């Protein structure tokens, strides 16, 4: 209740944030603005009429047209609008799990091999997000690295990027986060097989971020990916 | 420029799409309806109230009470906007890279501009989410499937033989052609993961900011970033018989692991190092002395 408010505050926040970015884009496209810098309606076939006839540039067009009403950009920083720091943030350690289920999902320990059948206990095991996080993981990681190093080689992104994302590295993560006091349970824990399953819940934890943030930024590739891998994702033989 | 206006419409209508979600999810989150579901309160020292005064909730509500005026979603809807089609695909074969030199680099094989002129790194971060992305289309598709399967799933589809069958459906094979007429198999396999990394350079926005820089902080320690076993007698050779005729010796001054040592002609320091064990910290102490041609001149009874 508490939890939900702050939950659904970040839920609001990212939306906000994302609102803030794509109103800007529109405001500012070139397709859009009155300029016409690359020359619309020059076109000696119908590409130009499809565009200019497009629900996307009716769209934007009409916003564009009512920022005399309201102006989004200036709404934003009328209130001082901070994308990445917010009064709520005393009030967490780390980014935030929208869904309580899905984050708690994220710290129960995968059982090896009564009671339960075999399609609610991956329901129960944190191992599906964990796959996801550990692939996310590495692809923000790399995004971060490539980004940040300009002028690196592979050999250097890969160094970089390897010395992060290991179990060590991540064994480290889940002490600094206190992943420790998130684990507590009825059994004492007085390591090997330990540090390795703190590091699966840090793996976990990203796996959920991702599945509550997964909207429309990475649609098209993700739609593209999809109907390319559709024969192969039929032979769901081994489900 | 009849390229450039394609690329500029997908960039716009993926603008559009986010902005068509973002505006669903302000208009109906619990916070800002007017059922109050949450039941945010008036009391001063609380979260309601932290919320209540945040930017966040100041900019939410006065959207929603701009709805009268022009209801977003409404404007969407009464236009027949669709987020995963539009005419303009008629005029392109896969998602659009808005980046006319980004998209050129991902189809450059193989000093700092060097790593610019190939598509080696591009490779490196398309191949990174080409994982991410099928691992999230396998997860949502397949909900009850095991991280076993979930794997083997997605490596039929990542492995380089399948990616050198895309970049033929594609024909990437037309575009990395040249003047010059399963090693060029691996090549045509990295022009896709390549291109993958063009379109998401291309796309990273806001929508998993929070994640990144978060990551980067944990990360900033990882990304931010001798001895002379002949020191001690060589220092003897000079010392140990000195202008002063007192005793060359070493003094220890932390007797636990973070050693410290002073080197010493009687009551005069000479110089001091902090070493690991005792004996290290003596020789790199030693080291610094057998630097310091003044001291040595000073107290070495030959000449140097
Ligand atoms: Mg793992
Ligand atoms: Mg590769």
Redesign the interface.
Known sequence: ??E???R????????????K???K??YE????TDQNV???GT?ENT??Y??L????????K??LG?RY??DLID??QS??????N???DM?IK??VVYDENLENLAFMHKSFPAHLN??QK?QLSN??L???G?????????????T?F?????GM??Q?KE??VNNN?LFD?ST?LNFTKRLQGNIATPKDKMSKRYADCVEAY?GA???D??????????????E??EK??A??S??
């Open positions: 209740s508490n939900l408010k702050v659904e505050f970040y839920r609001l926040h990212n939306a906000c944030v994302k609102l970015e794509s109103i884009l529109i496209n070139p397709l859009v690359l020359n619309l076109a590409i130009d499809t565009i006839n497009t629900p996307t540039l009716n769209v934007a009409t916003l009512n009403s309201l709404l934003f209130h001082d609008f901070k994308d990445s917010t009064d709520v009030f780390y980014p075999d399609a991956t191992e599906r964990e796959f996801l550990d692939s996310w993981l590495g692809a923000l990681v790399s995004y971060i690295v490539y940040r300009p002028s690196a080689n592979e992104l890969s970089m010395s992060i590295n993560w600094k990203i971020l991702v599945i943030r997964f909207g429309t930024e990475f649609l098209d590739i993700k739609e593209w990916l999809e390319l891998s192969k994702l032979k769901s081994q489900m």
